[PDB]
Design a protein around this ligand. Structure first.
Ligand SMILES: C=C(C)CCOP(=O)(O)OP(=O)(O)O
Ligand SMILES: C=C(C)CCOP(=O)(O)OP(=O)(O)O
Ligand SMILES: C=C(C)CCOP(=O)(O)OP(=O)(O)O
Ligand SMILES: C=C(C)CCOP(=O)(O)OP(=O)(O)O
Ligand SMILES: [Ca+2]
Ligand SMILES: [Ca+2]
Ligand SMILES: [Ca+2]
Ligand SMILES: [Ca+2]
Ligand SMILES: [Ca+2]
Ligand SMILES: [Ca+2]
Lengths: 290, 300
C-alpha cells in the first residue's frame, strides 16, 4: 500500500519534471516526439533513483534530476530499438511508436536528443551541490549506456539474431547484463553515488534485480496480453531468440526469478528496514503484469 | 592532392594541425581498444577515423592559449570529435541525407548495415560524454561537469539536433529560406559544436569565454559558407563525399541565396571578424587566426 503510493507519486514527479524541462524547448515535431517517448512507463528506473536517494538521505528535489535523466536515457534506447531497422515495433506503452506517428528521421533525432537530455539532466547543478557527484553520475551513466553497457547489450542481441547455434545460458546472461542490467544498475547505485557512499550493496542488489526483471520481461513475451503490456507479445519466438524461458522453460524461469528476489533482498541487509521499499520493488519486478 | 601546399599556411599552424590529428586518432585508438571486437565497435572506429579535426584542434589550441596541458585537453578534443562523428553517422543514414561515402570511405550503413549505423552513432554520442567527464579531462570536477552540461546544450534539441530538425523541415518543403533563416539554422546545425570547441580552452581554465564565443560565431558561419561552396564547386575526390547535393534536395544555402561570389566575399569578411575577436589575446592567438583563414581556403 505504501509501496504502491510511492511508485505512483514517483511516476507523477518524473512526468512533471519532463513537462517542465521539455516546455523550455521549441514547439517542433522532434520535441513533441521527445515528450511522446518519455510519457508513460512504469518508471522503474526513475523510482530506483528516487528510492535509493531516499535511502541515503538525499533530498527528493535533487534526486529528481537523476531520476528523470535515467528515464530520458531509457526512453531514447526504446525509440531506437523500435525502429524498422531494429526490432520494428508499431506500439510501445499502448501508443504508436515515434517512427509510426511521425517518421524514421524524427525517431532517430528524437532518440538522439533524449540521450543528450539525459546528460544535461545529471550535470545540471540541481542534481547535486557537489560537482564531484555530478561528474561521477555522468561518467558512470556514459559507461552504463555506451558500447560497454546498454549498446553492447544491443549489439550482442543483434549478433544472436543470426548466430549459427542458439545461445547458452551464460551467453544470454552476459547479454542481459548489458542490455537491461546496466541501466538498472546505474539507477540503483544512484542514491549511493549521490551521497558519495559505498555502492557495493546496491550493485549486488541490482545485479539480481536486473536478471529477475529480464526473466519477467521474457515471461511477459510468452504469457502476457499486449493490451496490458502495451507492446506486441510473441516476438521472441518469431525471431528464434534464446531467452530465459526458451532455455529454462517457464516453471524453472519463474522459480529462478523468485530465487533472485531473495538474493536481491539479502543484498540489502546492511541497510535494515530503511530498504524495505527496495525489497518490495524486487517483488514487484517479478509479480508485475506489464 | 588536396592543394594544401599551394595555400602556404603558416608553419606552426600546419605542424600543430598535423600533431592534433595524430593525437586525436591515437586517443580514439587507446580508448576504443578497451571495447569488445564487435561490428558496432569496428564501426565506431571507422566513423571516427579521418577528418580534418577542426573541432578537436580548436579545443587543443584554445587550451594552449590558456596554458592548459595537452594531456588534459586531449580528452575534450576527442570528445567533440566523437560527438561530431556520431552526428555524421546519423546524418548519412538512408532516412536522413542518404550518403554512401564520407571522408573518402563507405559510410557505416553501407559497410555494415543501418542498425549498426544507428547503434554506433548512439555509442559515439555516449563516448563523447565519457571522455569529457573522465578524470583525465580536468583536475576540477566543476570543470568536467560544466564541460558536459555545455556539451549537452550544444548538442541536443536546443543546438545541433535543433539545427538538424530545422534542416529536415526546410528540405521537405523545398522551402525558400531567407538569409536570417539560413543563419539561424546554421547556428544550431554547425555553429553550436564549433562554439563548444572554441570555448573549451577557456572553460578548462575557468576563464572568460566571451572572446572565444565571438570568434567561434564568425568562424562557424565562415566554415558553413565554405562547406556550401564545396557542395557547388568541389570535387568529390578531395572532399570525400558527394557534391551537388544541396540543389537536388531543395536546400537553400548561403550559396543558393547569395551566389558564389557574394558567399565567398561574406566568408572573407567573416575571417576578418573572427581575427578581430581575438585581439584581446594578442599574438598568442596567431594559430587561431590562421585557423580562420584555413576554414575558408581549404579544399576539403
Ligand atoms: C529493457 C527493457 C526490457 C525495455 C522495457 O523496459 P520496461 O518494461 O521497464 O519499460 P517501461 O516501463 O519504461 O515502458
Ligand atoms: C535496451 C533495450 C531497448 C532493451 C530492449 O529489450 P527488448 O527488445 O526485450 O525490450 P522490449 O522491446 O521487449 O520492451
Ligand atoms: C558540419 C558539417 C558541415 C559536417 C562536416 O564537417 P567537416 O567538414 O568538419 O568534416 P570532417 O573534417 O570531420 O570530415
Ligand atoms: C549536424 C550535422 C550532421 C551537419 C550536417 O550538415 P551537412 O549535411 O551540410 O554536412 P555534410 O553532409 O554536407 O558534410
Ligand atoms: Ca525490442
Ligand atoms: Ca532486439
Ligand atoms: Ca522483451
Ligand atoms: Ca549531410
Ligand atoms: Ca540535411
Ligand atoms: Ca554540406
Amino acid at each position: 500500500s505504501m509501496f504502491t503510493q510511492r511508485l505512483d507519486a514517483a511516476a507523477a514527479a518524473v512526468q512533471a519534471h519532463f513537462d517542465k524541462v521539455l516546455a523550455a524547448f521549441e514547439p517542433l515535431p522532434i520535441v513533441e516526439a521527445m515528450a511522446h517517448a518519455t510519457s508513460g512507463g512504469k518508471r522503474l528506473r526513475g523510482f530506483l533513483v528516487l528510492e535509493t536517494a531516499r535511502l541515503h538521505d538525499i533530498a527528493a528535489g535533487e534526486a529528481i534530476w537523476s531520476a528523470t535523466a535515467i528515464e530520458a536515457l531509457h526512453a531514447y534506447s526504446l525509440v531506437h530499438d523500435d525502429l524498422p531497422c531494429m526490432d520494428n515495433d508499431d506500439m510501445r506503452r499502448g501508443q504508436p511508436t515515434v517512427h509510426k506517428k511521425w517518421d524514421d528521421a524524427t525517431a532517430v533525432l528524437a532518440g538522439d536528443a533524449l540521450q543528450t537530455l539525459a546528460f544535461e539532466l545529471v550535470t545540471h547543478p540541481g542534481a547535486s551541490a557537489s560537482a564531484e557527484v555530478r561528474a561521477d553520475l555522468a561518467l558512470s551513466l556514459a559507461r552504463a549506456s555506451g558500447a560497454q553497457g546498454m549498446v553492447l547489450g544491443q549489439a550482442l542481441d543483434i549478433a544472436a539474431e543470426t548466430a549459427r547455434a542458439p545461445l547458452s545460458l551464460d551467453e544470454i546472461t552476459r547479454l542481459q547484463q548489458g542490455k537491461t542490467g546496466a541501466l538498472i544498475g546505474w539507477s540503483a547505485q544512484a542514491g549511493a553515488r549521490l551521497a558519495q557512499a559505498d555502492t557495493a550493496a546496491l550493485k549486488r542488489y541490482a545485479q539480481a534485480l536486473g536478471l529477475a526483471f529480464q526473466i519477467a520481461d521474457d515471461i511477459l513475451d510468452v504469457t502476457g496480453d499486449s493490451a496490458q503490456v502495451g507492446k506486441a507479445v510473441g516476438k521472441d519466438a518469431s525471431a528464434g531468440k534464446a531467452t530465459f524461458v526458451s532455455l529454462l522453460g517457464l516453471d524453472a524461469a519463474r522459480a529462478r526469478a523468485m530465487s533472485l528476489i531473495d538474493e536481491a533482498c539479502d543484498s540489502l541487509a546492511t541497510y535494515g528496514a530503511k530498504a524495505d521499499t527496495l525489497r518490495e520493488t524486487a517483488r514487484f519486478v517479478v509479480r508485475r503484469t506489464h
